Amino acid sequence: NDEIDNAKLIMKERRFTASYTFAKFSTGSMLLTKDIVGKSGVSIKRLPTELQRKFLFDDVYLDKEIEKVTIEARKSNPYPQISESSLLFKDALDYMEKTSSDYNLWKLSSILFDPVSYPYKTDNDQVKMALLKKERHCRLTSWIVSQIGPEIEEKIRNSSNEIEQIFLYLLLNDVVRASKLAIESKNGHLSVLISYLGSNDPRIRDLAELQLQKWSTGGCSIDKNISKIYKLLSGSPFEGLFSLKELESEFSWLCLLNLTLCYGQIDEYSLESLVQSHLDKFSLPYDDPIGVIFQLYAANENTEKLYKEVRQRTNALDVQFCWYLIQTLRFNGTRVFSKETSDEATFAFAAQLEFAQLHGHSLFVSCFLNDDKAAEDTIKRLVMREITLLRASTNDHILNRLKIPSQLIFNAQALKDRYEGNYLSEVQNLLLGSSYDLAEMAIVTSLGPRLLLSNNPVQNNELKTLREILNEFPDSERDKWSVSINVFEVYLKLVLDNVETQETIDSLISGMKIFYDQYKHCREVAACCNVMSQEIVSKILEKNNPSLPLGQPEKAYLR
Amino acid sequence: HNELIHDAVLDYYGKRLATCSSDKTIKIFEVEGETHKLIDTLTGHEGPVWRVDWAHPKFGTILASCSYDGKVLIWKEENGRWSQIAVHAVHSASVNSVQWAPHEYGPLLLVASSDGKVSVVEFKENGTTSPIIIDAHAIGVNSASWAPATSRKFVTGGADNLVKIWKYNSDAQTYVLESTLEGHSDWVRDVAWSPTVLLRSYLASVSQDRTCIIWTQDNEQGPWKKTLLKEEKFPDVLWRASWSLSGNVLALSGGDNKVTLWKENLEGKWEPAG
Amino acid sequence: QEVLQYSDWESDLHIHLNQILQTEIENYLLENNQVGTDELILPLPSHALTVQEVLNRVASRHPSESEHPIRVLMASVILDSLPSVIHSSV
């Protein structure tokens, strides 16, 4: 009516246009949107993961990681960190769905960024390195070889010439079938002439280049098949008169990395430079997850810097994989990474887990964080928020025994389960909690508004045992005392005894008068001081007061 | 009412929720899911209710409640029943903010009002409200969020359009004017400081100009840097802003219902995210 | 905490001992009757306070002045218990 014009005017001073919604955060970091299906009139929308991985809902994967990392209690801040990361990429070959090319991503990191196993001994430190070089190379090339296997046979059916069948059965590596048709094309030197996988010879390099150059002279029908044979043979599979950047479809980019890696001369020039030597001619996929692994292998010490670049564009280094890579190798100091990129990957990852709704899996990611402030206060804040996730499995109690200074989750329980109905239940488990201090006058803001008990000499002797918890607490500077808190304990000695006290016995009418200069929080903490006056009549003469409601305070109690 | 809802904010536990409206009440609807449960309807107000906030828990859960009439009602459960234990009514005009101090700091509710005033409610020794009157904006102070530790600190949002940062000193006893910001040209709605768990705070200082200017501090000792959520006037006008406890993700709902999960990426681009 | 400016063993003890005499003068003045019920706005602390027990407060508070034995000699003359200190130091 006029309440239309009124409401208008108020939200001129709020300046709101009338049609209000809001989005808030709850306690698991998810949204609360106004939708009139709620009984508040708001309903919770559970926020979804930045990147979905299947084994960030797998408890086994998390507890494996705990047991494959060196947990410290950090010397600066006891709240737990990680000294050294003994992570491996074969931890994710226990887990991950096995038909994603994620499994392929995990597989590829295992061969490169976790180094070969060495079962040989050497007598020279020049062959020490060569044997580790060949071992990683065949590993590398056997994984490539299986994943080009179909792609080799496609280009077998996209050709038809007999030298093509010899040439391409050599790359799919089946020498006994390679020379079979070489007998029927009339060859005894081209039947094998692709076979340099562990052979380096500088002479045939020369042969392959001269062979190109005689054919160029104008006219004559010269084989462009024998020219690919002598392209692989020259030691330089692009340069010359003929080239493999004119084959954009009679080989794939992935077969081409293999051609540079084994027919650039495996051991005459290093591995990773020839990986980079492919990535000059061609720029690899950002959306095939295995393409990116060979870029960040093409880059050695600029792995950290290619990560920041590929990331400006589409990601296949998306936040789980980069997290795993940087946090293995920056603790190790084998591949360099910036400590600031370390911090962004870690932090970003804890966000995705808090869309995953797991407080513990996040708590463990704060451990890799070694900024002393962040890995103090992220740990505190998690624990007092959602206590309830942290108790639920025995994986959860190994999150609760990183080097948790268990007791911390118990000191957040008695802050959590506290409510105003059962204030006294958990302020009791601050008192009897017995790792606390300053619960000594806090029990007095529960048991002052209801000095109701169960009022026998077993509850009162039990309440003796409760004011001895007071002295169990550590003793503070200028705080902690028991010379006015034994007031309520010398009360439990004049309530099992009759004897009129002129303070021949007690500090308790004095103790009430101190308790009308003490009462702090609440004026029913001041009026209980008036109620405990009344429960002790003929045992005092009332130099305090008994407890608008006047009609019957009783002004006669003296003798 | 529950259909032109203007606030619904939870406690730090996330188990208790208090929703207000144009109902002239505070219908307490705690979180049991998308079902919530009435415990009491608190009548004490006259006129539209704007903001409530439960206490941060180390000094109870204690519901303030600010409203048209002039009144901030301190409600507290005391022996399983409620009782308005103080009244904090030192204002005449529309009271527009109530936000408790976080339980990294002590008992310091922050009341703000478009009468010109901020009021730093000092809880005395029976819970007896006593404010020190300060001014931030002299058209009216429409909002007031706290700055926790990513001494005491807060932020207020202008009806003068300025977003003034306020920082406590104990040799002058009040909030020293730390700095003054302005990229705004119609009035501020909500000034939301981020609770990041590390050195970083962005401030989505929400404005009526159909724009929200995200001031950014990359680390706290980096300065306030002008960036925009997007670099155009929005079709409609923009409402309540929040920042997460861990991740620092923006969340706002628009007039057309612009869902916002646009967090600042590497490249410095407020980038859509989960 | 702003009657502390030296914050050490003896700075605690001064302010401590101030309250020991200030409770007990009102008691003494209740014998001599300068305390009544028109003589307060706040009920009087007619508890007598003990010297040695508030020294055990001080001692546990500052093990930074337990390393100064002279600061321990200082304590013991206000206790007035000179053989006991001299027997603990041989």
From Swiss-Prot, chain A:
It comes from the Eukaryota. The modification Phosphothreonine is found at T17. It is a peripheral membrane protein. It is found in: Nucleus, Nuclear pore complex; Nucleus membrane. This is Nucleoporin NUP145C. It comes from Saccharomyces cerevisiae (strain ATCC 204508 / S288c). The chain holds residues 735 to 1303 of 1317 of the full protein.
Curated annotation (Swiss-Prot), chain B:
Coiled coil: none annotated. It is found in: Cytoplasmic vesicle, COPII-coated vesicle membrane; Endoplasmic reticulum membrane; Nucleus, Nuclear pore complex; Vacuole membrane. GO terms for molecular function: structural molecule activity. The keyword Lipid biosynthesis does not apply. It is a peripheral membrane protein. Its main location: membrane. It holds the Pfam family WD40. InterPro entries: Sec13/Seh1_fam, WD40/YVTN_repeat-like_dom_sf, WD40_repeat_dom_sf, WD40_rpt. Transmembrane segments: none annotated. PROSITE patterns: WD_REPEATS_2, WD_REPEATS_REGION. One of its GO terms (cellular component) is cell periphery. One of its GO terms (biological process) is positive regulation of TORC1 signaling. It comes from the Eukaryota. WD repeats lie at residues 1-39, 44-85, 90-131, 136-176, 183-225, 233-272. Changing W243R: Growth inhibited above 30 degrees Celsius. Keywords: Cytoplasmic vesicle, Endoplasmic reticulum, ER-Golgi transport, Membrane, mRNA transport, Nuclear pore complex, Nucleus, Protein transport, Repeat, Translocation, Transport, Vacuole, WD repeat. Functions as a component of the nuclear pore complex (NPC) and the COPII coat. It is one of 5 proteins constituting the COPII coat, which is involved in anterograde (ER to Golgi) double-membrane transport vesicle formation. First the small GTPase SAR1, activated by and binding to the integral ER membrane protein SEC12, exchanges GDP for GTP and recruits the heterodimer SEC23/24, which in turn recruits the heterotetramer SEC13-SEC31. The polymerization of COPII coat complexes then causes physically the deformation (budding) of the membrane, leading to the creation of a transport vesicle. Present with 21400 molecules/cell in log phase SD medium. PANTHER family: NUCLEAR PORE COMPLEX PROTEIN SEC13 / SEH1 FAMILY MEMBER (PTHR11024), PROTEIN SEC13 HOMOLOG (PTHR11024:SF2). Belongs to the WD repeat SEC13 family. This is Protein transport protein SEC13. The lineage of its organism: Eukaryota, Fungi, Dikarya, Ascomycota, Saccharomycotina.
Curated annotation (Swiss-Prot), chain C:
It is found in: Nucleus, Nuclear pore complex; Nucleus membrane. It comes from the Eukaryota. Transmembrane segments: none annotated. Functions as a component of the nuclear pore complex (NPC). NPC components, collectively referred to as nucleoporins (NUPs), can play the role of both NPC structural components and of docking or interaction partners for transiently associated nuclear transport factors. NUP84 is involved in nuclear poly(A)+ RNA export, in NPC assembly and distribution, as well as in nuclear envelope organization. Belongs to the Nup84/Nup107 nucleoporin family. Component of the nuclear pore complex (NPC). NPC constitutes the exclusive means of nucleocytoplasmic transport. NPCs allow the passive diffusion of ions and small molecules and the active, nuclear transport receptor-mediated bidirectional transport of macromolecules such as proteins, RNAs, ribonucleoparticles (RNPs), and ribosomal subunits across the nuclear envelope. Due to its 8-fold rotational symmetry, all subunits are present with 8 copies or multiples thereof. Present with 8580 molecules/cell in log phase SD medium. This is Nucleoporin NUP84. It comes from Saccharomyces cerevisiae (strain ATCC 204508 / S288c) (Baker's yeast). The chain holds residues 274 to 363 of 726 of the full protein.
